[PDB]
Amino acid sequence: MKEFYLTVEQIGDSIFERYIDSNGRERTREVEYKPSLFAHCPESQATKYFDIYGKPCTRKLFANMRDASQWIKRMEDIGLEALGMDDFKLAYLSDTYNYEIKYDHTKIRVANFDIEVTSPDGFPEPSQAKHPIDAITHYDSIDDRFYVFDLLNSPYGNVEEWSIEIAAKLQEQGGDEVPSEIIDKIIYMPFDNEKELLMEYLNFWQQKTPVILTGWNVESFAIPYVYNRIKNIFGESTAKRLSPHRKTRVKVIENMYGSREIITLFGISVLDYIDLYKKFSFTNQPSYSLDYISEFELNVGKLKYDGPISKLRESNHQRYISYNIIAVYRVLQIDAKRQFINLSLDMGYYAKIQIQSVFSPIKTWDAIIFNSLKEQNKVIPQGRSHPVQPYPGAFVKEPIPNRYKYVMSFDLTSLYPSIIRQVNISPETIAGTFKVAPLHDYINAVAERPSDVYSCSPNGMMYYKDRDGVVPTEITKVFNQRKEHKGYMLAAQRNGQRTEVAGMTAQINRKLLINSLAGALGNVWFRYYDLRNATAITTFGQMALQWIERKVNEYLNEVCGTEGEAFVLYGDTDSIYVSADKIIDKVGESKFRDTNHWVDFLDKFARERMEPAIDRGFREMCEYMNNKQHLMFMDREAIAGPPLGSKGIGGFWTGKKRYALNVWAMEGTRYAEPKLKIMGLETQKSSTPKAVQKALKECIRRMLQEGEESLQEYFKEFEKEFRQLNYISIASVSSANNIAKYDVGGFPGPKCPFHIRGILTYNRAIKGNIDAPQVVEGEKVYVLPLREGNPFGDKCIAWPSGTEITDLIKDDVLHWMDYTVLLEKTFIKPLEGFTSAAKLDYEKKA
DNA sequence: TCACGTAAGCAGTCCGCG
DNA sequence: GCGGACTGCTTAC
Ligand SMILES: Nc1nc2c(ncn2[C@H]2C[C@H](O)[C@@H](COP(=O)(O)NP(=O)(O)OP(=O)(O)O)O2)c(=O)[nH]1
Ligand SMILES: Nc1nc2c(ncn2[C@H]2C[C@H](O)[C@@H](COP(=O)(O)NP(=O)(O)OP(=O)(O)O)O2)c(=O)[nH]1
Ligand SMILES: [Ca+2]
Ligand code: NA
């Protein structure tokens, strides 16, 4: 069988690698890797190594990775380029596995674990590990078993063994209702004391060493707590056993808010699922706790319980253990749907990197490009330092705030990667420059043609047409791979066999990699950073969008015989929005039998008339810029309008990036019932309260489908009833940054943000109460305004999102929450923006 | 929120300033 | 009042 690596590390002059051999067995080996770097040489010095610019290079074989690292220093001292992959472990992977890696995931030990710690005096800080670990559930992907470690005796009480029979009982039987598909997969291990529990866990850890270590908040809590707790009791020599190479290190994470403290376990790849979720899910959630996410993803959260979790083990040890098992399983269910782990394994093995590097698109792309270049015996350039500088981005047209009855939309296919491929943009394909005219001249095709020999961008860059660049070459491959999976996602959407969400992630998360490459060219840490290339992409995007805007207006003017009219109402980056009122009027709205009739008509007109006109409109631009390959593909997206015969307005814009459409068709998907397409509005902002999002969305639905009278009817009913709503559902949400920065003596300091003020108000209310939930820096909070004269002392209070507010102050908050201010700022004010733009009244006049 | 990007809207604070 | 400069936060693409 083909060999593939599991983990790889660099410790001194040795490479530590865990891998699967040809027999399918997991092996470990330490290799004295002798790396090689490159330096430019005279042409007379024959070689097979050249850089990306065709300049000859000499291969320097070093006795060890130390000599190679020191050589880079000397070359820097001299001031000459030191070419080659300076990340020696990546080069080792490239040499060891010089072929496309086809891995077997069943041989990869993926570990999903979570722990429980009873703490009567606040959150148990992993740096201290003051309190005993009384529960550990450890799922092993190879064994397909849930190994449960249960502490029976601790200074916080002695308990009886957990019952698997009771845990299997339904909730209405007093049981825990632990899923039947995992109850037979539970391995229960009771322990008389903590030392025995931890000792056995390490023996368990060494026998089944995790390759992929995951869970929820395992990196910031579970891993450092276990490491420190074992350290305090047995010493670091025993805590080092958590690594298969017996080597760890305390890693400090830097950001714009302070430093962090995690533990690096060499030989292990940690993929904390909360980090995998935040990056790959394409959602911004009010709360990122496991219970909130499980509710969103699975319509079911963690196991519910009574009283604080600090007293759960003593009061209901049965539930306490079952709660712990379910926590681990919830992550396995979320992953079975999201497939973020399998995505990471795909990306990591495709790029030939450490699996945990999938968090970094830069490192990922650097190794893809390196391996690609090495294949042709080409040598990558040395990374350089650059000052952070801004550069132009996409174009956004200022829409006229108004209702728009009939709307048809068109969008380009993966614009930026396509631009890269079409123009042939790459660090080595640069050919020169041309004198630039104002951009509006290229849009109107009145400026002189840039070149008859090179592929050009309206930013002034010229690229070779007859040679390949590594960047267009490698981005094409990943683009094509997504296209193959996208051919499966649209199926399930139209058929809705199944496949969708996973087939969605398969395609949508692949695009995150290909979209990040264009951005990478504008990041100073990318090896192939170049603002000329990065601007060439975005400027081309600006041109193409407004070029096709002009072309669509021209085509629709001559076809409708109207002259000079504006059909394109709005555009953003890769899309355009066309008013279809005039098209409908040509046939006559009375000549349509029903809603589907005019939808079928606009669909036929878009495909047979507009689309071929659009493609012709792009082929000439391709000729104008003398591009290498025509790839500006813009096809029909949405078809929107009110129901036939109704009083709905179909859609509306309030401004840039803010609009609502009543869509009947999306590409190949024809909706049985009209779907709302709402972008940018408060219904989409996670900072808007849950019950307000729903109410606003219903206000919008009535505007687009039913009209003014229905909207006013619903508004009047919502204002009369909204006080009944649960306080959490009407609470605002916001991320909490730099709390201490605006903290002066527990009271709001200068320029204190409104939500931060709510946090300080909360901190005073719970001050002295060591068991009360603490607002964490960098996390999110629920926010409620407070009526004047409230006992809390300020205009608002804020508490951790995704949770009920503590029973200490809950009754007071309910009594003093300002329903009026809440209604005006979150509901009425945005609704005023929607209706005034749509020329509608949410309240009666005369 | 730990070396993909820019564009751009709304909430709120504090400032000249008339 | 009231408008702009600014921070903070959010989304679209
Ligand atoms: N092409 C390339 N090689 C690199 C780079 N960085 C380090 N190397 C190193 C990796 C390799 O150590 C060396 C050249 O590897 P090969 O010519 O592809 N195969 P050969 O039969 O010559 O192998 P050996 O040298 O063991 O005889 O340059 C890089 O960026 N590019
Ligand atoms: N750097 C960067 N640019 C982006 C990102 N998202 C969008 N852009 C810019 C670059 C993109 O070229 C452009 C549009 O990106 P899509 O909305 O994803 N449209 P596509 O046709 O690719 O996906 P589908 O086939 O599913 O419709 O916006 C991003 O996360 N990063
Ligand atoms: Ca698209
Ligand atoms: Na696109």
Numbering used by the authors: 1 to 496, 546 to 895
Question: Could you give the paper's own sentences about this structure?
Answer:
As expected, the ternary complex structure reveals an assembled active site with dGpnpp occupying the incoming dNTP binding pocket. Strikingly, however, while the base and sugar of the incoming nucleotide are found in positions that are consistent with other RB69 polymerase structures, both molecules in the ASU present an altered conformation for the three phosphate groups. Neither the dNTP binding metal, nor the catalytic metal ions are found in their expected positions. Interestingly, this aberrant active site conformation correlates with similar changes to those observed in the apo crystal structure, suggesting that the altered position of the incoming nucleotide is related to the conformation of D411 and, in turn, to the missing D714 side chain. As seen in the apo mutant structure, the D411 is flipped away from the active site and this correlates with the repositioning of the E686 and E716 side chains.
The gp43 DNA polymerase of the RB69 bacteriophage (RB69 Pol) bears primary responsibility for the faithful and efficient replication of the viral genome. RB69 Pol belongs to the B-class of DNA polymerases and is closely related to T4 phage DNA polymerase. This high fidelity is achieved through the combined action of its polymerase (Pol) and 3′-5′-exonuclease (Exo) activities, which enable stringent selection of the correct incoming nucleotide and excision of the mismatches resulting from misincorporations.
